[PDB]
Design a protein around this ligand. Structure first.
Ligand SMILES: CC(C)(C(N)=O)C(=O)NCCCNc1nc(Nc2cccc(NC(=O)N3CCCC3)c2)ncc1Br
Ligand SMILES: [Cl-]
Length: 276
């Protein structure tokens, strides 16, 4: 089809700024479609030795075809920049709703947790480890269904993701795996229900000390079935986390009492519960 150029677009406001990128809202002049265009500067990529990560990311986004992930429509580059045309997730980051509404009720916690597990099942199925899952990476579309992004740092089957969602193995033998993603899910489930991440401290080194020592507590408010699930994900021994291959995969995880009423088969077709 048509190989796109910057002039083919009417760029608008900035949707997000990373250390190596800026996602900008663009409207395609010929169709009026809105896209979230990720813009990367070749110079900064090179001098910062990031080529391996930019290639990785595009190559993962090529292999993914599922509704809970931001899609890559096209790419193009100019003299000093690379451009990736991605799905524009209208409602933005999930972190905003957590902060906006405070915390989630059980219905919302279960529906959104189910969408995350279904998306992890898919990703793990292609042999890709996100390695940096967090509420800032999980977006909500026009219909409030999740749309996961930020794959520059994924591992296809070195680094350390956001301090509070990093698992123990990384802080030790520095090696992450599929269970690293499950650790982050436990952290995120806790965060949805409590309104706050489980391992938190004044500084990063302190956050790390807690993680390795598994120093965190559950508020009395915490729904008990969600709590039982969180204790099955927040495990130091990665071969013991509900969801990993040694624990027989997603079947047992999906079969958790917390998910009793979920219909796993058509979630994105389902009307998400109203965030209150
Ligand atoms: C990877 C990274 C760091 C980036 N900037 O490249 C990134 O932030 N990705 C997610 C957001 C941008 N990408 C994207 N953002 C949206 N949608 C969207 C729509 C409205 C608001 C926001 N942004 C926020 O809510 N933010 C909270 C405060 C600042 C952003 C994001 N859709 C697709 C992408 Br790809
Ligand atoms: Cl992004």
């Amino acid at each position: 089809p048509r190989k796109k150029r910057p002039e083919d677009f009417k760029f608008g406001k900035i949707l997000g700024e990373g250390s190596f990128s800026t996602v900008v809202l663009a409207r395609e002049l010929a169709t009026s479609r809105e896209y979230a265009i990720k813009i990367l500067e070749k110079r900064h990529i090179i001098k910062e030795n990031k080529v391996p990560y930019v290639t990785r990311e595009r190559d993962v986004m090529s292999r993914l075809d599922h509704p809970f992930f931001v899609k890559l429509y096209f790419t193009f580059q100019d003299d000093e920049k690379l451009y990736f045309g991605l799905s524009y997730a209208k409602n933005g980051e999930l972190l905003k709703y957590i902060r906006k509404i405070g915390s989630f009720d059980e219905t919302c916690t279960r529906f959104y947790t189910a969408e995350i597990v279904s998306a992890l099942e898919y990703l793990h199925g292609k042999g890709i480890i996100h390695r940096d899952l967090k509420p800032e990476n999980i977006l909500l579309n026009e219909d409030m269904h999740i749309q996961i992004t930020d794959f520059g740092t994924a591992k296809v089957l070195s680094f350390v993701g956001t301090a509070q969602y990093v698992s123990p193995e990384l802080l030790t033998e520095k090696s992450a795996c599929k269970s690293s993603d499950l650790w982050a899910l436990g952290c995120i489930i806790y965060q949805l229900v409590a309104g706050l991440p489980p391992f938190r401290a004044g500084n990063e080194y302190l956050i790390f000390q807690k993680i390795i020592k598994l120093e965190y507590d559950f508020p009395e408010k915490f729904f008990p079935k969600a709590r039982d699930l969180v204790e099955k994900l927040l495990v130091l021994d990665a071969t013991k986390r509900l969801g990993c291959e040694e624990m027989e995969g997603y079947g047992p995880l999906k079969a958790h009492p917390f998910f009793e009423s979920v219909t796993w088969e058509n979630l994105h077709q389902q009307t998400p519960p109203k965030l209150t």
